[PDB]
Amino acid sequence: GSSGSSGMSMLKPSGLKAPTKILKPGSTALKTPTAVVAPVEKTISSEKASSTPSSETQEEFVDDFRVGERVWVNGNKPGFIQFLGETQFAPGQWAGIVLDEPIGKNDGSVAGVRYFQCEPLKGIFTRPSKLTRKVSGPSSG
């Protein structure tokens, strides 16, 4: 019960600093001849894709998580953990994850206390134990 905060906040900006509003400029036709990549491949002689390198994914004693990892809340909600620890409203361990869809409840803030900056209806506070790696369930189909 000693290892707490050291120094004074986390002074680690991002990089680009100037914009202070929202917008989407670009109403012209053809600006620069910029080509994209080709994630696909030639398939004329039948057979598509490859598929081979499979993963085992062990269970182990799941009793901890790390910030900046993809997890599935309730085994059906992919998101990124932003907060990991105790809250300022309820006594216990919580995890502020950021969902990838407008199906959340909180916005990463409780009673004004900002735990992790995220988009509305995405930042939910749930127990890490509830989180799961990748989607998985019964063997029905």
Side-chain angles (χ1 to χ4, degrees), residues 1-38:
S2 267
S3 318
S5 267
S6 170
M8 47 152 94
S9 217
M10 291 192 280
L11 209 148
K12 218 155 226 54
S14 179
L16 298 90
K17 209 189 191 171
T20 50
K21 286 210 219 282
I22 184 69
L23 54 152
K24 286 173 167 161
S27 65
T28 320
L30 315 140
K31 255 199 258 306
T32 327
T34 170
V36 291
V37 289

PDB file of all heavy atoms in Angstrom, residues 1-38:
ATOM      1  N   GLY A   1       0.828  -1.237   0.000  1.00  0.00           N
ATOM      2  CA  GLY A   1       0.000   0.000   0.000  1.00  0.00           C
ATOM      3  C   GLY A   1       0.843   1.260   0.000  1.00  0.00           C
ATOM      4  O   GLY A   1       0.479   2.259   0.622  1.00  0.00           O
ATOM      5  N   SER A   2       1.972   1.215  -0.699  1.00  0.00           N
ATOM      6  CA  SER A   2       2.871   2.361  -0.778  1.00  0.00           C
ATOM      7  C   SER A   2       3.085   2.785  -2.228  1.00  0.00           C
ATOM      8  O   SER A   2       3.070   3.974  -2.546  1.00  0.00           O
ATOM      9  CB  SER A   2       4.215   2.028  -0.127  1.00  0.00           C
ATOM     10  OG  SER A   2       4.228   2.408   1.238  1.00  0.00           O
ATOM     11  N   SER A   3       3.286   1.804  -3.102  1.00  0.00           N
ATOM     12  CA  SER A   3       3.504   2.077  -4.519  1.00  0.00           C
ATOM     13  C   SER A   3       2.306   2.798  -5.125  1.00  0.00           C
ATOM     14  O   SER A   3       1.335   2.167  -5.544  1.00  0.00           O
ATOM     15  CB  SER A   3       3.765   0.772  -5.275  1.00  0.00           C
ATOM     16  OG  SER A   3       4.628  -0.078  -4.542  1.00  0.00           O
ATOM     17  N   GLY A   4       2.380   4.124  -5.167  1.00  0.00           N
ATOM     18  CA  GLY A   4       1.295   4.912  -5.724  1.00  0.00           C
ATOM     19  C   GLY A   4       1.735   5.749  -6.910  1.00  0.00           C
ATOM     20  O   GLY A   4       2.194   5.214  -7.919  1.00  0.00           O
ATOM     21  N   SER A   5       1.597   7.064  -6.787  1.00  0.00           N
ATOM     22  CA  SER A   5       1.983   7.977  -7.856  1.00  0.00           C
ATOM     23  C   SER A   5       3.372   8.556  -7.600  1.00  0.00           C
ATOM     24  O   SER A   5       3.720   8.881  -6.465  1.00  0.00           O
ATOM     25  CB  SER A   5       0.962   9.109  -7.983  1.00  0.00           C
ATOM     26  OG  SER A   5      -0.032   8.792  -8.942  1.00  0.00           O
ATOM     27  N   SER A   6       4.159   8.681  -8.664  1.00  0.00           N
ATOM     28  CA  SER A   6       5.510   9.220  -8.555  1.00  0.00           C
ATOM     29  C   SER A   6       5.692  10.423  -9.475  1.00  0.00           C
ATOM     30  O   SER A   6       5.269  10.402 -10.631  1.00  0.00           O
ATOM     31  CB  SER A   6       6.540   8.142  -8.895  1.00  0.00           C
ATOM     32  OG  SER A   6       7.839   8.698  -9.019  1.00  0.00           O
ATOM     33  N   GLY A   7       6.324  11.469  -8.954  1.00  0.00           N
ATOM     34  CA  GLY A   7       6.550  12.666  -9.743  1.00  0.00           C
ATOM     35  C   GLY A   7       5.351  13.594  -9.746  1.00  0.00           C
ATOM     36  O   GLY A   7       5.037  14.216  -8.733  1.00  0.00           O
ATOM     37  N   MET A   8       4.680  13.686 -10.890  1.00  0.00           N
ATOM     38  CA  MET A   8       3.509  14.544 -11.022  1.00  0.00           C
ATOM     39  C   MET A   8       2.840  14.346 -12.379  1.00  0.00           C
ATOM     40  O   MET A   8       3.253  14.936 -13.377  1.00  0.00           O
ATOM     41  CB  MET A   8       3.903  16.012 -10.844  1.00  0.00           C
ATOM     42  CG  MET A   8       5.127  16.414 -11.649  1.00  0.00           C
ATOM     43  SD  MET A   8       5.128  18.164 -12.086  1.00  0.00           S
ATOM     44  CE  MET A   8       6.090  18.848 -10.738  1.00  0.00           C
ATOM     45  N   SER A   9       1.803  13.515 -12.406  1.00  0.00           N
ATOM     46  CA  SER A   9       1.076  13.240 -13.639  1.00  0.00           C
ATOM     47  C   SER A   9       1.996  12.627 -14.690  1.00  0.00           C
ATOM     48  O   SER A   9       3.201  12.497 -14.474  1.00  0.00           O
ATOM     49  CB  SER A   9       0.447  14.526 -14.182  1.00  0.00           C
ATOM     50  OG  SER A   9      -0.820  14.269 -14.762  1.00  0.00           O
ATOM     51  N   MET A  10       1.420  12.252 -15.828  1.00  0.00           N
ATOM     52  CA  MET A  10       2.188  11.651 -16.912  1.00  0.00           C
ATOM     53  C   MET A  10       2.339  12.626 -18.076  1.00  0.00           C
ATOM     54  O   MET A  10       1.462  12.723 -18.935  1.00  0.00           O
ATOM     55  CB  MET A  10       1.513  10.366 -17.392  1.00  0.00           C
ATOM     56  CG  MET A  10       1.569   9.237 -16.377  1.00  0.00           C
ATOM     57  SD  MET A  10       1.092   7.646 -17.083  1.00  0.00           S
ATOM     58  CE  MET A  10      -0.693   7.782 -17.047  1.00  0.00           C
ATOM     59  N   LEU A  11       3.456  13.346 -18.099  1.00  0.00           N
ATOM     60  CA  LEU A  11       3.721  14.312 -19.158  1.00  0.00           C
ATOM     61  C   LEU A  11       4.280  13.620 -20.396  1.00  0.00           C
ATOM     62  O   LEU A  11       5.495  13.540 -20.581  1.00  0.00           O
ATOM     63  CB  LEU A  11       4.703  15.377 -18.668  1.00  0.00           C
ATOM     64  CG  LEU A  11       4.553  16.748 -19.330  1.00  0.00           C
ATOM     65  CD1 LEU A  11       4.911  17.856 -18.352  1.00  0.00           C
ATOM     66  CD2 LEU A  11       5.420  16.834 -20.577  1.00  0.00           C
ATOM     67  N   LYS A  12       3.386  13.122 -21.244  1.00  0.00           N
ATOM     68  CA  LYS A  12       3.790  12.437 -22.467  1.00  0.00           C
ATOM     69  C   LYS A  12       2.841  12.766 -23.615  1.00  0.00           C
ATOM     70  O   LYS A  12       1.965  11.970 -23.956  1.00  0.00           O
ATOM     71  CB  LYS A  12       3.834  10.925 -22.238  1.00  0.00           C
ATOM     72  CG  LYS A  12       4.982  10.233 -22.955  1.00  0.00           C
ATOM     73  CD  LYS A  12       5.364   8.930 -22.271  1.00  0.00           C
ATOM     74  CE  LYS A  12       6.869   8.805 -22.104  1.00  0.00           C
ATOM     75  NZ  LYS A  12       7.451   9.989 -21.412  1.00  0.00           N
ATOM     76  N   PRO A  13       3.003  13.951 -24.232  1.00  0.00           N
ATOM     77  CA  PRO A  13       2.153  14.381 -25.348  1.00  0.00           C
ATOM     78  C   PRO A  13       2.109  13.351 -26.473  1.00  0.00           C
ATOM     79  O   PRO A  13       2.634  12.247 -26.336  1.00  0.00           O
ATOM     80  CB  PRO A  13       2.825  15.670 -25.831  1.00  0.00           C
ATOM     81  CG  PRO A  13       3.570  16.178 -24.645  1.00  0.00           C
ATOM     82  CD  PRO A  13       4.021  14.959 -23.890  1.00  0.00           C
ATOM     83  N   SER A  14       1.479  13.722 -27.583  1.00  0.00           N
ATOM     84  CA  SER A  14       1.366  12.831 -28.730  1.00  0.00           C
ATOM     85  C   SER A  14       2.326  13.247 -29.840  1.00  0.00           C
ATOM     86  O   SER A  14       3.160  12.455 -30.282  1.00  0.00           O
ATOM     87  CB  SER A  14      -0.069  12.825 -29.259  1.00  0.00           C
ATOM     88  OG  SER A  14      -0.196  11.973 -30.384  1.00  0.00           O
ATOM     89  N   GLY A  15       2.204  14.493 -30.284  1.00  0.00           N
ATOM     90  CA  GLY A  15       3.069  14.992 -31.338  1.00  0.00           C
ATOM     91  C   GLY A  15       2.498  16.216 -32.026  1.00  0.00           C
ATOM     92  O   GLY A  15       2.949  17.336 -31.791  1.00  0.00           O
ATOM     93  N   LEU A  16       1.502  16.003 -32.881  1.00  0.00           N
ATOM     94  CA  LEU A  16       0.869  17.097 -33.607  1.00  0.00           C
ATOM     95  C   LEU A  16      -0.016  17.923 -32.680  1.00  0.00           C
ATOM     96  O   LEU A  16      -0.941  17.400 -32.057  1.00  0.00           O
ATOM     97  CB  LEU A  16       0.040  16.552 -34.771  1.00  0.00           C
ATOM     98  CG  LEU A  16       0.839  15.804 -35.840  1.00  0.00           C
ATOM     99  CD1 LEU A  16       0.924  14.323 -35.505  1.00  0.00           C
ATOM    100  CD2 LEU A  16       0.213  16.007 -37.211  1.00  0.00           C
ATOM    101  N   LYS A  17       0.273  19.218 -32.591  1.00  0.00           N
ATOM    102  CA  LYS A  17      -0.497  20.116 -31.738  1.00  0.00           C
ATOM    103  C   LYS A  17      -0.782  21.435 -32.449  1.00  0.00           C
ATOM    104  O   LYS A  17       0.132  22.211 -32.730  1.00  0.00           O
ATOM    105  CB  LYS A  17       0.252  20.378 -30.431  1.00  0.00           C
ATOM    106  CG  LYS A  17      -0.664  20.668 -29.253  1.00  0.00           C
ATOM    107  CD  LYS A  17       0.124  21.128 -28.036  1.00  0.00           C
ATOM    108  CE  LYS A  17      -0.744  21.148 -26.789  1.00  0.00           C
ATOM    109  NZ  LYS A  17       0.059  21.389 -25.557  1.00  0.00           N
ATOM    110  N   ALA A  18      -2.056  21.682 -32.735  1.00  0.00           N
ATOM    111  CA  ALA A  18      -2.466  22.908 -33.411  1.00  0.00           C
ATOM    112  C   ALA A  18      -3.984  22.958 -33.581  1.00  0.00           C
ATOM    113  O   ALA A  18      -4.627  23.932 -33.188  1.00  0.00           O
ATOM    114  CB  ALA A  18      -1.773  23.030 -34.760  1.00  0.00           C
ATOM    115  N   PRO A  19      -4.581  21.906 -34.170  1.00  0.00           N
ATOM    116  CA  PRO A  19      -6.031  21.842 -34.386  1.00  0.00           C
ATOM    117  C   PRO A  19      -6.811  21.877 -33.076  1.00  0.00           C
ATOM    118  O   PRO A  19      -6.410  21.262 -32.088  1.00  0.00           O
ATOM    119  CB  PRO A  19      -6.239  20.495 -35.093  1.00  0.00           C
ATOM    120  CG  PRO A  19      -4.898  20.125 -35.629  1.00  0.00           C
ATOM    121  CD  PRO A  19      -3.898  20.701 -34.669  1.00  0.00           C
ATOM    122  N   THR A  20      -7.926  22.600 -33.076  1.00  0.00           N
ATOM    123  CA  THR A  20      -8.762  22.713 -31.886  1.00  0.00           C
ATOM    124  C   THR A  20     -10.241  22.658 -32.254  1.00  0.00           C
ATOM    125  O   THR A  20     -11.083  23.243 -31.573  1.00  0.00           O
ATOM    126  CB  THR A  20      -8.459  24.017 -31.146  1.00  0.00           C
ATOM    127  OG1 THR A  20      -8.477  25.117 -32.039  1.00  0.00           O
ATOM    128  CG2 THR A  20      -7.113  24.012 -30.451  1.00  0.00           C
ATOM    129  N   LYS A  21     -10.553  21.948 -33.335  1.00  0.00           N
ATOM    130  CA  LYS A  21     -11.931  21.817 -33.793  1.00  0.00           C
ATOM    131  C   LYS A  21     -12.085  20.611 -34.714  1.00  0.00           C
ATOM    132  O   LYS A  21     -11.108  19.934 -35.036  1.00  0.00           O
ATOM    133  CB  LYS A  21     -12.372  23.088 -34.521  1.00  0.00           C
ATOM    134  CG  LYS A  21     -12.626  24.264 -33.593  1.00  0.00           C
ATOM    135  CD  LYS A  21     -13.685  25.198 -34.156  1.00  0.00           C
ATOM    136  CE  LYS A  21     -13.336  26.656 -33.899  1.00  0.00           C
ATOM    137  NZ  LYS A  21     -13.631  27.058 -32.496  1.00  0.00           N
ATOM    138  N   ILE A  22     -13.319  20.349 -35.136  1.00  0.00           N
ATOM    139  CA  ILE A  22     -13.601  19.226 -36.022  1.00  0.00           C
ATOM    140  C   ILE A  22     -13.981  19.711 -37.419  1.00  0.00           C
ATOM    141  O   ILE A  22     -14.608  20.759 -37.573  1.00  0.00           O
ATOM    142  CB  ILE A  22     -14.737  18.343 -35.462  1.00  0.00           C
ATOM    143  CG1 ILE A  22     -14.958  17.124 -36.361  1.00  0.00           C
ATOM    144  CG2 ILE A  22     -16.021  19.149 -35.325  1.00  0.00           C
ATOM    145  CD1 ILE A  22     -13.816  16.131 -36.325  1.00  0.00           C
ATOM    146  N   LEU A  23     -13.596  18.941 -38.431  1.00  0.00           N
ATOM    147  CA  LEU A  23     -13.897  19.293 -39.815  1.00  0.00           C
ATOM    148  C   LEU A  23     -13.413  18.207 -40.770  1.00  0.00           C
ATOM    149  O   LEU A  23     -12.759  17.250 -40.357  1.00  0.00           O
ATOM    150  CB  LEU A  23     -13.247  20.631 -40.175  1.00  0.00           C
ATOM    151  CG  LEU A  23     -11.743  20.712 -39.912  1.00  0.00           C
ATOM    152  CD1 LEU A  23     -11.085  21.695 -40.867  1.00  0.00           C
ATOM    153  CD2 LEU A  23     -11.477  21.109 -38.468  1.00  0.00           C
ATOM    154  N   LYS A  24     -13.742  18.361 -42.048  1.00  0.00           N
ATOM    155  CA  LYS A  24     -13.342  17.392 -43.062  1.00  0.00           C
ATOM    156  C   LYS A  24     -13.163  18.066 -44.421  1.00  0.00           C
ATOM    157  O   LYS A  24     -14.026  17.962 -45.293  1.00  0.00           O
ATOM    158  CB  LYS A  24     -14.382  16.275 -43.165  1.00  0.00           C
ATOM    159  CG  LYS A  24     -14.336  15.292 -42.008  1.00  0.00           C
ATOM    160  CD  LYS A  24     -15.486  14.301 -42.075  1.00  0.00           C
ATOM    161  CE  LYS A  24     -15.278  13.141 -41.114  1.00  0.00           C
ATOM    162  NZ  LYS A  24     -16.551  12.423 -40.827  1.00  0.00           N
ATOM    163  N   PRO A  25     -12.035  18.768 -44.620  1.00  0.00           N
ATOM    164  CA  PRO A  25     -11.747  19.458 -45.881  1.00  0.00           C
ATOM    165  C   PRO A  25     -11.433  18.486 -47.013  1.00  0.00           C
ATOM    166  O   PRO A  25     -10.833  17.434 -46.793  1.00  0.00           O
ATOM    167  CB  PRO A  25     -10.521  20.309 -45.548  1.00  0.00           C
ATOM    168  CG  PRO A  25      -9.850  19.586 -44.432  1.00  0.00           C
ATOM    169  CD  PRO A  25     -10.951  18.943 -43.633  1.00  0.00           C
ATOM    170  N   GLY A  26     -11.839  18.846 -48.227  1.00  0.00           N
ATOM    171  CA  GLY A  26     -11.592  17.993 -49.374  1.00  0.00           C
ATOM    172  C   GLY A  26     -12.791  17.902 -50.296  1.00  0.00           C
ATOM    173  O   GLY A  26     -13.569  16.949 -50.224  1.00  0.00           O
ATOM    174  N   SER A  27     -12.943  18.894 -51.168  1.00  0.00           N
ATOM    175  CA  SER A  27     -14.057  18.923 -52.108  1.00  0.00           C
ATOM    176  C   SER A  27     -13.557  19.065 -53.542  1.00  0.00           C
ATOM    177  O   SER A  27     -14.230  19.651 -54.390  1.00  0.00           O
ATOM    178  CB  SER A  27     -15.007  20.076 -51.773  1.00  0.00           C
ATOM    179  OG  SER A  27     -14.368  21.329 -51.946  1.00  0.00           O
ATOM    180  N   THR A  28     -12.371  18.526 -53.807  1.00  0.00           N
ATOM    181  CA  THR A  28     -11.781  18.592 -55.139  1.00  0.00           C
ATOM    182  C   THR A  28     -11.760  17.215 -55.795  1.00  0.00           C
ATOM    183  O   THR A  28     -11.968  16.199 -55.133  1.00  0.00           O
ATOM    184  CB  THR A  28     -10.362  19.156 -55.065  1.00  0.00           C
ATOM    185  OG1 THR A  28     -10.295  20.226 -54.138  1.00  0.00           O
ATOM    186  CG2 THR A  28      -9.852  19.668 -56.395  1.00  0.00           C
ATOM    187  N   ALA A  29     -11.507  17.191 -57.099  1.00  0.00           N
ATOM    188  CA  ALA A  29     -11.457  15.939 -57.844  1.00  0.00           C
ATOM    189  C   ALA A  29     -10.034  15.628 -58.295  1.00  0.00           C
ATOM    190  O   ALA A  29      -9.435  16.385 -59.058  1.00  0.00           O
ATOM    191  CB  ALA A  29     -12.390  16.002 -59.042  1.00  0.00           C
ATOM    192  N   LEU A  30      -9.499  14.510 -57.819  1.00  0.00           N
ATOM    193  CA  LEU A  30      -8.145  14.098 -58.173  1.00  0.00           C
ATOM    194  C   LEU A  30      -7.125  15.138 -57.724  1.00  0.00           C
ATOM    195  O   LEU A  30      -7.027  16.218 -58.307  1.00  0.00           O
ATOM    196  CB  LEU A  30      -8.036  13.879 -59.684  1.00  0.00           C
ATOM    197  CG  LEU A  30      -9.187  13.086 -60.310  1.00  0.00           C
ATOM    198  CD1 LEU A  30      -9.574  13.678 -61.657  1.00  0.00           C
ATOM    199  CD2 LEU A  30      -8.806  11.621 -60.458  1.00  0.00           C
ATOM    200  N   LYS A  31      -6.368  14.808 -56.683  1.00  0.00           N
ATOM    201  CA  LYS A  31      -5.356  15.715 -56.156  1.00  0.00           C
ATOM    202  C   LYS A  31      -3.953  15.193 -56.453  1.00  0.00           C
ATOM    203  O   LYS A  31      -3.167  15.852 -57.134  1.00  0.00           O
ATOM    204  CB  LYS A  31      -5.539  15.896 -54.646  1.00  0.00           C
ATOM    205  CG  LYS A  31      -6.149  17.236 -54.265  1.00  0.00           C
ATOM    206  CD  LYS A  31      -5.890  17.571 -52.805  1.00  0.00           C
ATOM    207  CE  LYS A  31      -7.118  17.310 -51.946  1.00  0.00           C
ATOM    208  NZ  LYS A  31      -8.322  18.013 -52.470  1.00  0.00           N
ATOM    209  N   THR A  32      -3.647  14.007 -55.940  1.00  0.00           N
ATOM    210  CA  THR A  32      -2.339  13.397 -56.152  1.00  0.00           C
ATOM    211  C   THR A  32      -2.484  11.934 -56.568  1.00  0.00           C
ATOM    212  O   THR A  32      -3.324  11.209 -56.035  1.00  0.00           O
ATOM    213  CB  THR A  32      -1.496  13.495 -54.880  1.00  0.00           C
ATOM    214  OG1 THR A  32      -1.803  14.680 -54.166  1.00  0.00           O
ATOM    215  CG2 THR A  32      -0.006  13.492 -55.146  1.00  0.00           C
ATOM    216  N   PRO A  33      -1.664  11.477 -57.533  1.00  0.00           N
ATOM    217  CA  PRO A  33      -1.711  10.093 -58.015  1.00  0.00           C
ATOM    218  C   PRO A  33      -1.136   9.107 -57.003  1.00  0.00           C
ATOM    219  O   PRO A  33      -0.094   8.494 -57.239  1.00  0.00           O
ATOM    220  CB  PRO A  33      -0.849  10.131 -59.277  1.00  0.00           C
ATOM    221  CG  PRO A  33       0.110  11.246 -59.045  1.00  0.00           C
ATOM    222  CD  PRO A  33      -0.631  12.269 -58.229  1.00  0.00           C
ATOM    223  N   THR A  34      -1.821   8.960 -55.873  1.00  0.00           N
ATOM    224  CA  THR A  34      -1.378   8.050 -54.824  1.00  0.00           C
ATOM    225  C   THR A  34      -2.091   6.704 -54.933  1.00  0.00           C
ATOM    226  O   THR A  34      -3.315   6.629 -54.812  1.00  0.00           O
ATOM    227  CB  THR A  34      -1.630   8.664 -53.448  1.00  0.00           C
ATOM    228  OG1 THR A  34      -1.421   7.706 -52.425  1.00  0.00           O
ATOM    229  CG2 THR A  34      -3.031   9.211 -53.283  1.00  0.00           C
ATOM    230  N   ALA A  35      -1.318   5.648 -55.161  1.00  0.00           N
ATOM    231  CA  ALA A  35      -1.875   4.307 -55.287  1.00  0.00           C
ATOM    232  C   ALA A  35      -1.904   3.596 -53.937  1.00  0.00           C
ATOM    233  O   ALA A  35      -1.188   3.974 -53.011  1.00  0.00           O
ATOM    234  CB  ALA A  35      -1.077   3.497 -56.296  1.00  0.00           C
ATOM    235  N   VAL A  36      -2.734   2.563 -53.835  1.00  0.00           N
ATOM    236  CA  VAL A  36      -2.855   1.799 -52.599  1.00  0.00           C
ATOM    237  C   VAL A  36      -2.197   0.430 -52.733  1.00  0.00           C
ATOM    238  O   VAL A  36      -1.664   0.088 -53.789  1.00  0.00           O
ATOM    239  CB  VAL A  36      -4.329   1.610 -52.196  1.00  0.00           C
ATOM    240  CG1 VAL A  36      -4.942   2.935 -51.772  1.00  0.00           C
ATOM    241  CG2 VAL A  36      -5.120   0.989 -53.338  1.00  0.00           C
ATOM    242  N   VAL A  37      -2.237  -0.349 -51.657  1.00  0.00           N
ATOM    243  CA  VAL A  37      -1.643  -1.681 -51.656  1.00  0.00           C
ATOM    244  C   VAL A  37      -2.651  -2.733 -52.105  1.00  0.00           C
ATOM    245  O   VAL A  37      -3.846  -2.461 -52.205  1.00  0.00           O
ATOM    246  CB  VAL A  37      -1.113  -2.058 -50.259  1.00  0.00           C
ATOM    247  CG1 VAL A  37       0.124  -1.242 -49.917  1.00  0.00           C
ATOM    248  CG2 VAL A  37      -2.195  -1.868 -49.208  1.00  0.00           C
ATOM    249  N   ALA A  38      -2.157  -3.939 -52.375  1.00  0.00           N
ATOM    250  CA  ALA A  38      -3.013  -5.034 -52.815  1.00  0.00           C
ATOM    251  C   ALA A  38      -2.980  -6.192 -51.819  1.00  0.00           C
ATOM    252  O   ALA A  38      -2.115  -7.064 -51.900  1.00  0.00           O
ATOM    253  CB  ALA A  38      -2.587  -5.512 -54.195  1.00  0.00           C
TER     254      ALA A  38
END
